[PDB]
RNA sequence: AUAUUGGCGAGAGACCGAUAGCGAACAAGUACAGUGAUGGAAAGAUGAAAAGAACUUUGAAAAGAGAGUGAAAAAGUACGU
RNA sequence: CGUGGAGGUCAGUGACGAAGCCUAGACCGUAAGGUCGGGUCGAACGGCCUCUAGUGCAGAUCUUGGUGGUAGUAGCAAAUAUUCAAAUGAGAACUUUGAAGACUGAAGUGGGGAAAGGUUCCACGUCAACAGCAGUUGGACGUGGGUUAGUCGAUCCUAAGAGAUGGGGAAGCUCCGUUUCAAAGGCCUGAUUUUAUGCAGGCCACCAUCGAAAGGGAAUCCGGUUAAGAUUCCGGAACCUGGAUAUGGAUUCUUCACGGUAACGUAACUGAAUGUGGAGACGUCGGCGCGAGCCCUGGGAGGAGUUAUCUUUUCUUCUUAAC
RNA sequence: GCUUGUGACGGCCCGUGAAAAUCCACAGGAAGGAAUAGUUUUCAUGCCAGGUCGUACUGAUAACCGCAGCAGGUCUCCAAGGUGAACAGCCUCUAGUUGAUAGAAUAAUGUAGAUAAGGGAAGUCGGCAAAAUAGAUCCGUAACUUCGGGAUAAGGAUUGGCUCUAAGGGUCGGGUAGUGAGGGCCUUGGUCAGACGCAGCGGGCGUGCUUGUGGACUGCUUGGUGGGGCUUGCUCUGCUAGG
RNA sequence: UGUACAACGGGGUAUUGUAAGCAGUAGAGUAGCCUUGUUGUUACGAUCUGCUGAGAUUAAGCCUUUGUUGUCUGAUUUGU
């Protein structure tokens, strides 16, 4: 060990700059003479990972790791390994390697800052505080160190220490602040105010001191919105009402279009009990802002007189109908969610009286806007023929509006006509090809109309077309979600339709002379193969949204240092909250539920087709053999044609690169080994570790914990659901019946778990569900359910129909009851349930 | 008043044009061969101007694949056509 | 008909490109030849009437220069001889190191030299050309350093030889001769107190020069120090020549010494011209005596190796100069 | 036992087998000289200088010459141990090389060596080429002749290894008894050059290191505070310092 | 995947010729000596005899062998 270290030191400068081939050549020349060099292998792994290679880089890194016994080597190798782990989404190993390097003897304090970022990604703040303290004591000439120390002491719990540190820093640097460093300083001041907020509590002297400090720093703080908000909060936490009212009036003068400021002023003034005071206040404020909308929308929520309410509604709808806004119904969208038989008749009467005095030629714009508003109002009131008549009259009057076509497509979708709606919306979109919202709506409605190829062809227009025949790669690079969700649902519907198709084809079973279904089977086989391939592609596309969220969370590497260098601690806390709440999105929950349903269906049908029927030799023959008719050449030609078609299909639906993911066909995802383990270690642990209290889907947790052998979690979730959302829901009774049928000794599980669940049920719910009817086969649970919770619930009936194999409570009677109970709903939902859910 | 391929200083061609013209248009009594009196050559002009190759990659290099200079490098120093 | 050049003309053409080259492209002329078109390529060139020749191509075993069949054949066969492990690298039948196995079998394939080569010896880096294969190797390439004399030679003298003046012939470049019909030169004493070294005398005639770095010859070694020089440098000890000059010894009033019969001796113990003698100075063959070196061997003091069996065992060190 | 140098020698000649420079000696007698000192530096010591040019390497199947690193030509001193008359032929030590494109089959035909049953030159222009004979001692040895030769003529007999026998030399020595020198005198006793030199209690010359104690800076389980900003957790310049 | 084959070893058989090592009052005779002898012994001593009718090879172009050790798919080319 003499010349190899010199060559490594002379080649390290190539990696330090912007050189890769010259360093790789030197590493190869070194390894050609001695292959047992750990530093050279560790550098070559990172060099191959930084240029594009993945397999060779991982192999070299694994070899370098295996060629290490103790923790006593050069710190450069450990630093390179830490960089590699940081670049390969490995935080624990990177932290361990950096700690081992710093424990050996490194004179580079900046490495400590790296740890201050790494642990900042895993939440380990106990050692992060010490790392920040060391990195601050190492260099005393940058405000980023002070900001990082303040943030670390505020997040942990050292509030007084952070206040003292900020005070000492401001005393030492009083007057030595440049111009560009003023704003940041102001931001820091605001952050200190936030710290003082944590020292506010309910003490009078503390709040007075915070108010005095805020009034003293007001001439120095540049941010005025947050300053005035904190001032109003302090005034509300004390007792001064006039000063708080003045602050809120100043905020309104700064920005009148804000419902939050108006609500806070209403709460501060204490006039929420009397209606005349609020009426006079809003009538006086209307003269100050005649062009706003909250001052005219909020007073429509506490009116009791019918004549006054009608007059206010008329004065609110007259300017909107005169100027013509594409959101008039939106302006009354939330009110319709809270009022109905009391407000909607008066609004309809006013609109009819206004329309009876208009003219289709003198005032065409108010005429068409009144027609659109009437169509919206009737569509909201479950009316369809009159809405279609109004939209047809509007199209005949002025066929140059996209909103009319959008409303027609929405009505046709609500009436179960998806294809006609897609056709009308495409025809309307072809009128002007410059808007993207209408294109996205058309693609979504085509995906909802069992039309995927045309939807993709329409979407492949505004996308960047380079190394692909369509724009699927561009749609995946712009970070999409709704498109994938809407396309996977169409794939699932098309796959479920094939089940009914095969059932109808097998119901004949070659009845008498039925050679038509026997002589024609190649097309059916090709259609089934295509449907299976698209179903696999759907499962492949499902593995994207969680991966996208993981990539978004991992891309916060340089942000931990940027938020401290630029001086944005409040933005850092906001980013932390955003990263913690990432797993609380509705689209994420929907995608996770769909993935769970798919995995459970795959587990079920795999365990069903594993050991069933008989004669495997007569079933594993398939085709590719016509006896004495050249079977080898025929099978070879068939395989060649299938491969040639699959290559073109994969190039058409190309989304992921070939060097990044080889599972393009998706055959390995639909035939995995442990689906439940993968779903728990990839899709469930994150949602379990990052979740609130009231926002928690108990149905998905119950479905996940049912088929694993753990019933205590099921009982806890059921108890929490009954305590939160009450006990008068059909879902509670359905889950209780499912649990009672699962605790039967006939089902192969754990007798101890069944016994403890039975004891818990007998101890908790003793006068709700008969727990002594598990031995009688004549007791019908459907009658008891419809007597207690009733048959009007749809979610409970859907859950009982989904879990009917393990709970024998009938089938035909349940289906008839569901059909009879679905009638007071919308036709499209009824059709979808009868076609797929039933 | 006559002679003058040697030497210095000048003006010219119906003269050959570099395998010629004096042996030599260049490091031409140079190198080279012989102990000798002596014999005695071959070798021009890339490009207006080196501005003749910064830089990437392959290769241990030589050099190649580029890029680029440059009217034009089927003008790259073994170079007018 | 074609080419070099010149006079007149077409107010000729031409880098929006000529000359030249290629053209299983065409046209004209019986033919020597000319014209256009496509590519090359870049600087000047063509027709008409005449004039001026260093004016035409296939070989003259013609000259210069370049290139094929042979042919990737012939051939890389004497001096009895190579293998294994590590290092330098892209590359070890060929390099270096280690272990062997072998040659010269000491009138050596070794140490030093006279010719002869003239920086080829040595260090660093280096493989484009040389080492008829290969090569990171070299007496190859580029950059640098390296040759110390009183004791060696040299220098000088001379033999066999060459040769210049005085002279003799040749028109002459020059031939003979060189002590031969040549009145040819330096060398010691005395003068001194203008003499500085000239002169008043005794006198000797040798007769020019060059030429044998193994002929003769005034003078030394020891040990070590360099990537190369060692008898030259370093430390020590002597010898020869030349010129200065003092000390002591010896000699003397038997002024230039004694002893031994003798051959001769004792540390010095006046002295020139001239003459004489000796050294210098010398054949081969064969033996004898002596000395030195080489070689063998004993005692004794060390070091190395054997030891299935045995050997007071086999080898090596124990040296001394010039004076 | 080998090489070299030297001295007297024996034979050789109608070849009897070199100069000069330079030095030394003798004959000779010119000239000079004494001691109150004049000579003597061919006696020993004491002073200075000896100039100029060569100096490396090769001296050869690679450094010279043969158009090239070409089994060709080039002089001189040195050189061991064993067999062996021998400086030959063979093996080895000191010393110098491992370099002369390499490997595998290893068939014709060739280069360099041989083997060859019986006959034997009959082969060929010719036994030229091969092999024989051929190392040391002995017997024997013709014709001829210029009587010196022929003559190792021809022809043959022995010739290994171990252990023994006889022979060819030198250097030494020719008495007993009384005496002197035992010119070795050992030894017992000393006389006084019995010195030079072995070793120690030692002294000086500074000085080589520590236990136990007045002190010192940098530091810690840290007890307690001049001040500032937060007007509570808290922050900073810090400070008197108990141990 | 096999009474298949290869390298060793056991033999059959052949070439040469009685080894290595020890022992023997063997050994032509010679020295040291001591109780000096009716075999006196310590060493030198070419050789002779006893195991040796073994020892050296036994295969490259001889024969066999369930013994020992193993091997058993490295690439190219083909059509009326």
Neighbours of A116 (CB within 10 A): 25
Whether nucleic acid strand D comes within 7 Å of the CB of A199, the answer is: yes
- For the CA of A55 and the C1' of C129, the distance in angstroms is 48
CB A189 within 8 A of CB A155: no
Question: In terms of residues, how long is chain A?
Answer: 838
Please give the Cα distance from A739 to A525 (Å, whole number). 41
CB A450 within 8 A of CB A492: no
Please give the Cα distance from A459 to A474 (Å, whole number). 10
Please give the Cα distance from A244 to A246 (Å, whole number). 5
Bases on strand B under 7 Å from any protein CB? 56-60
Please give the Cα distance from A119 to A131 (Å, whole number). 10
Structure tokens at A685: 């642990």
- For the CA of A320 and the C1' of E12, the distance in angstroms is 126
Residue A81's Cα: distance from chain center in Å? 34
- For the CA of A493 and the C1' of D113, the distance in angstroms is 103
Neighbours of A67 (CB within 10 A): 13
| Vertex A724 angle, CA A588 and A685, to 5° | 35
For residue A794, what are the contacts with CB-CB under 8 A and spacing of at least 6?
Answer: A821, A822, A825
- For the CA of A183 and the C1' of D193, the distance in angstroms is 116
Please give the Cα distance from A387 to A247 (Å, whole number). 48
Please give the Cα distance from A401 to A403 (Å, whole number). 6
Exposure of A47 in the CB half-sphere (CA atoms within 13 A): 24
Whether nucleic acid strand B comes within 7 Å of the CB of A25, the answer is: yes
- For the CA of A229 and the C1' of C316, the distance in angstroms is 110
Nucleotide nearest to A33 (CA to C1'): C89
Which H helix or E strand runs over A102?
Answer: helix A92-105
Residues 5-24 of chain A sitting with CB below 7 angstroms of strand B: 19-22, 24
- For the CA of A292 and the C1' of C75, the distance in angstroms is 111
Please give the Cα distance from A427 to A430 (Å, whole number). 5
Please give the Cα distance from A266 to A272 (Å, whole number). 6
A154: three-class secondary structure by DSSP: helix
- Backbone phi and psi for residue A663, each to the nearest 5 degrees, phi listed first: -85, 70
| Vertex A753 angle, CA A751 and A754, to 5° | 65
For residue A117, what are the contacts with CB-CB under 8 A and spacing of at least 6?
Answer: A557, A560, A561
- For the CA of A661 and the C1' of E51, the distance in angstroms is 87
Q: Which residue has the tokens 């009022």?
A: A339
CB A29 within 8 A of CB A23: no
Structure tokens at A423: 């056709």
Nucleotide nearest to A18 (CA to C1'): B56
Cα–Cα nearest to A251, from A230, A281, A221: A230
Please give the Cα distance from A699 to A656 (Å, whole number). 33
CB A268 within 8 A of CB A241: yes
Whether nucleic acid strand B comes within 7 Å of the CB of A830, the answer is: no
A740: three-class secondary structure by DSSP: helix
For residue A114, what are the contacts with CB-CB under 8 A and spacing of at least 6?
Answer: A82, A86, A98
Structure tokens at A628: 């004495």
Helix ranges restricted to H, A324-361: 328-331, 333-338, 344-355
Whether nucleic acid strand D comes within 7 Å of the CB of A203, the answer is: no
- For the CA of A9 and the C1' of C187, the distance in angstroms is 93
Helix ranges restricted to H, A324-452: 328-331, 333-338, 344-355, 364-380, 385-397, 402-414, 418-429, 437-447
Cα–Cα nearest to A41, from A20, A17, A57: A57
A124: three-class secondary structure by DSSP: coil
Q: Nucleotide D229: nearest residue by CA–C1'?
A: A167
Cα–Cα distances (Å) from A835 to A202, A422, A493, A494, A601, in that order, read 60, 20, 9, 11, 18
Backbone CA torsion sign across A119, A120, A121, A122: positive
Structure tokens at A481: 């979600």
Whether nucleic acid strand D comes within 7 Å of the CB of A165, the answer is: yes
CB A743 within 8 A of CB A758: yes
Cα–Cα nearest to A73, from A31, A115, A29, A104: A104
Please give the Cα distance from A359 to A367 (Å, whole number). 7
Structure tokens at A101: 């390097």
Please give the Cα distance from A440 to A105 (Å, whole number). 58
Cα–Cα nearest to A313, from A289, A288, A287, A331: A331
Q: Which residue has the tokens 């950096």?
A: A98
Helix ranges restricted to H, A582-724: 586-610, 631-652, 675-679, 685-689, 698-706, 712-724
Please give the Cα distance from A407 to A391 (Å, whole number). 8
Please give the Cα distance from A552 to A481 (Å, whole number). 14
CB A537 within 8 A of CB A491: yes
CB A556 within 8 A of CB A575: yes
CB A703 within 8 A of CB A679: no
Nucleotide nearest to A205 (CA to C1'): D231
Please give the Cα distance from A694 to A725 (Å, whole number). 10
Please give the Cα distance from A313 to A70 (Å, whole number). 80
Which H helix or E strand runs over A764?
Answer: helix A751-764
Q: Which residue has the tokens 């939160």?
A: A724
Cα–Cα nearest to A545, from A601, A498, A633, A484: A484
Nucleotide nearest to A19 (CA to C1'): B56
- For the CA of A192 and the C1' of D202, the distance in angstroms is 89
Bases on strand D under 7 Å from any protein CB? 228-236
- For the CA of A549 and the C1' of C273, the distance in angstroms is 140
Nucleotide nearest to A14 (CA to C1'): B56
Please give the Cα distance from A40 to A34 (Å, whole number). 10
Please give the Cα distance from A404 to A384 (Å, whole number). 15
Structure tokens at A687: 């949602």
- Backbone phi and psi for residue A656, each to the nearest 5 degrees, phi listed first: -100, 145
Q: Which residue has the tokens 């390290």?
A: A12
A624: three-class secondary structure by DSSP: coil
Burial A337-361 (b: 16+ CB within 10 A, else e): eebeeebbebbeebbeebeeeeeee
CB A689 within 8 A of CB A581: no
- For the CA of A421 and the C1' of E3, the distance in angstroms is 86
Whether nucleic acid strand C comes within 7 Å of the CB of A276, the answer is: no
Please give the Cα distance from A133 to A112 (Å, whole number). 10
A208: three-class secondary structure by DSSP: helix
Rounded to the nearest 10°, the torsion over CA A182, A184, A189, A190 is 130
CB A111 within 8 A of CB A559: no
Please give the Cα distance from A31 to A41 (Å, whole number). 8
- Angle at which helix A586-610 crosses helix A545-554, to 10 degrees, equals 130
Please give the Cα distance from A432 to A726 (Å, whole number). 52
Structure tokens at A829: 């939902």
Please give the Cα distance from A111 to A16 (Å, whole number). 15
- For the CA of A192 and the C1' of D91, the distance in angstroms is 107
Nucleotide nearest to A161 (CA to C1'): D234
CB A740 within 8 A of CB A774: yes
CB A456 within 8 A of CB A472: yes
Please give the Cα distance from A579 to A10 (Å, whole number). 42
Nucleotide nearest to A23 (CA to C1'): B57
Cα–Cα nearest to A94, from A74, A104, A79: A79
- For the CA of A618 and the C1' of E1, the distance in angstroms is 34
| Vertex A415 angle, CA A377 and A593, to 5° | 100
- For the CA of A784 and the C1' of C57, the distance in angstroms is 130
- For the CA of A130 and the C1' of E41, the distance in angstroms is 103
For residue A573, what are the contacts with CB-CB under 8 A and spacing of at least 6?
Answer: A151
**A394-398, Cβ contacts within 8 angstroms, sequence gap of 24 or more:** A394/A368, A397/A360, A397/A364, A397/A367, A397/A368, A397/A371, A398/A364, A398/A368
Whether nucleic acid strand D comes within 7 Å of the CB of A153, the answer is: yes
Please give the Cα distance from A256 to A289 (Å, whole number). 8
Cα–Cα distances (Å) from A351 to A332, A348, A354, A360, A550, in that order, read 13, 5, 5, 15, 51
Residues 29-48 of chain A sitting with CB below 7 angstroms of strand C: 29, 32-33
Cα–Cα distances (Å) from A624 to A214, A615, A683, A826, in that order, read 83, 19, 40, 49
| Vertex A596 angle, CA A592 and A597, to 5° | 120
Nucleotide nearest to A21 (CA to C1'): B57
CB A491 within 8 A of CB A535: yes
- Angle at which helix A364-380 crosses helix A344-355, to 10 degrees, equals 150
């Amino acid at each position: 060990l003499k010349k190899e270290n010199d060559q490594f030191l002379e080649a390290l400068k190539l990696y330090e700059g912007k050189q890769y081939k010259k360093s790789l050549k030197l590493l190869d020349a070194i390894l050609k003479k001695d292959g047992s060099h750990v530093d050279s292998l560790a550098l070559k792994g990172l060099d191959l990972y930084s240029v594009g290679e993945k397999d060779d880089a991982a192999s070299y890194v694994a070899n370098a790791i295996r060629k290490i016994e103790g923790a006593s080597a050069s710190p450069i190798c450990c630093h390179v390994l830490g960089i590699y782990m940081r670049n390969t989404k490995e935080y624990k190993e990177s932290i361990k390697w950096f700690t081992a390097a710093l424990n050996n003897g490194s004179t580079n304090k900046q490495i400590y800052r790296d740890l201050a970022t790494l642990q900042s990604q895993i939440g380990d703040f106990k050692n992060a505080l010490v790392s920040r303290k060391k990195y601050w004591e190492a260099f005393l000439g940058y405000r980023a160190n002070w900001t990082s120390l303040a943030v670390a002491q505020d997040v942990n719990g050292e509030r007084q220490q952070a206040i003292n540190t900020l005070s000492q820093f401001e005393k030492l640097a009083e007057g030595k602040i440049s111009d560009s460093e003023k704003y940041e300083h102001s931001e820091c001041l605001m952050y200190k105010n936030d710290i003082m907020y944590k020292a506010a509590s309910d003490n009078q002297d503390k709040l007075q001191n915070v108010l005095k400090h805020l009034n003293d720093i007001e001439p120095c703080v540049f941010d005025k919105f947050g300053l005035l908000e904190r001032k109003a909060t302090i005034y509300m936490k004390l007792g001064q009402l006039k000063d708080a009212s003045i602050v809120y009036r100043t905020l309104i003068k700064r920005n009148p279009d804000n419902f939050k400021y108006y609500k806070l002023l209403e709460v501060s003034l204490g006039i929420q009990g009397d209606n005349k005071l609020k009426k006079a206040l809003y009538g006086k404020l209307e003269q100050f802002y005649p062009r706003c909308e909250p001052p005219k929308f909020i007073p429509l929520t506490f009116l009791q007189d019918k004549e006054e309410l009608s007059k206010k509604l008329r004065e609110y709808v007259l300017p909107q109908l005169e100027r013509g806004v594409p959101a008039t119904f939106s302006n009354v969208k939330p009110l319709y969610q809270r009022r109905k038989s009391k407000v909607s008749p008066l609004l309809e009467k006013i609109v009819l009286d206004y329309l009876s005095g208009l003219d289709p030629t003198q005032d065409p714009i108010p005429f068409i806007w009144t027609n659109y508003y009437l169509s919206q109002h009737f569509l909201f009131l479950k009316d369809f023929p009159k809405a279609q008549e109004y939209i047809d009259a509007a199209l005949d009057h002025t066929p140059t509006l996209v909103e009319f076509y959008i409303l027609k497509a929405r009505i046709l979708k609500h009436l179960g006509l998806m294809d006609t709606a897609a056709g009308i919306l495409e025809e309307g979109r072809q009128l002007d090809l410059q808007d993207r919202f209408i294109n996205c709506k058309t693609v979504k409605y085509f995906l909802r109309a069992n039309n995927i190829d045309k939807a993709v062809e329409v979407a492949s227009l505004f996308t960047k077309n380079d190394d692909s025949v369509n724009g699927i790669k561009d749609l995946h690079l712009v970070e999409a979600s709704w498109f994938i969700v809407e396309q996977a649902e169409a794939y699932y519907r098309l796959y479920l339709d094939r089940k009914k198709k095969l059932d109808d084809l097998a119901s004949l079973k070659k009845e008498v002379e039925s050679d038509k279904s026997e002589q024609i089977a190649n097309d059916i086989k090709e259609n089934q193969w295509l449907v299976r391939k698209y179903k696999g592609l759907a499962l492949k596309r499902f593995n994207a949204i969680p991966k996208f969220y993981k990539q978004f969370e991992d891309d916060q590497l340089d942000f931990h240092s940027y938020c401290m260098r630029k001086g944005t601690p409040r933005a850092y806390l906001e980013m932390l909250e955003w990263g913690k709440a990432l797993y609380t999105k509705p689209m994420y929950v929907r995608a996770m539920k769909e993935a769970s349903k798919l995995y459970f269906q795959m587990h079920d049908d795999r365990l069903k087709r594993k050991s069933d029927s008989l004669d495997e030799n007569s079933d594993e023959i398939q085709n590719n053999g016509q006896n004495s008719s050249s079977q080898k050449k025929k099978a070879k030609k068939e395989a060649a044609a299938m491969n040639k078609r699959k290559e073109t299909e994969a190039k058409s639906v190309a989304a992921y690169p070939s060097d990044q993911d080889n599972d393009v066909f998706g055959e390995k995802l639909i035939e995995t080994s442990t689906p439940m383990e993968d779903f728990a270690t990839e899709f469930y642990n994150n949602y379990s570790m990052q979740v609130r209290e009231d926002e928690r889907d108990y149905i998905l947790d119950f479905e996940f914990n049912y088929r694993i052998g753990k019933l205590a979690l099921c009982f806890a979730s059921l108890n929490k659901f009954a305590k939160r959302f009450g006990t008068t829901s059909g879902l509670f009774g359905s889950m209780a019946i499912v649990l009672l049928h699962a605790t039967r000794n006939d089902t192969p599980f754990d007798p101890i778990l069944k016994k403890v669940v039975t004891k818990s049920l007998e101890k908790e719910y003793s006068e709700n569900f008969p727990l002594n009817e598990i031995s009688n086969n004549s007791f019908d649970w459907l009658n008891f359910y419809q007597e207690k919770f009733g048959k009007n619930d749809i979610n409970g009936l859907l859950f009982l129909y989904r879990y009917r194999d393990d709970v024998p409570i009938g089938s035909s009677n349940l289906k008839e009851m569901i059909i009879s109970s679905l009638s007071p709903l919308e036709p499209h939902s009824q059709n979808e349930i009868l076609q797929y859910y039933l």
